[PDB]
Amino acid sequence: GPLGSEVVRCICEVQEENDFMIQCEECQSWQHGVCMGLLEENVPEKYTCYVCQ
């Protein structure tokens, strides 16, 4: 994001993407779905990350 904020900002603090990334509706950064306790089939349309929820 602006001011060079990290696009991948997950609780695991790993920047590398995997096969299932999800974008927070509030802060607009991305997390690994598995870190957020989610699966492809249960991530909601209005997903909010660990920081923002």
Residues that bind Zn ion (CB under 5 A): 10, 12, 24, 26-27, 32, 35, 49, 51-52
For residues 31 and 12, what is the distance between their CA atoms, to the nearest angstrom? 9
Q: What's the token pair of residue 41?
A: 């089939």
Shortest Cβ 8–Zn ion spacing (Å): 8
Q: Which is nearer to Zn ion, 22 or 32 (CB)?
A: 32
Q: What's the token pair of residue 18?
A: 């995997």
Shortest Cβ 52–Zn ion spacing (Å): 3
Shortest Cβ 4–Zn ion spacing (Å): 17
For residues 1 and 43, what is the distance between their CA atoms, to the nearest angstrom? 22
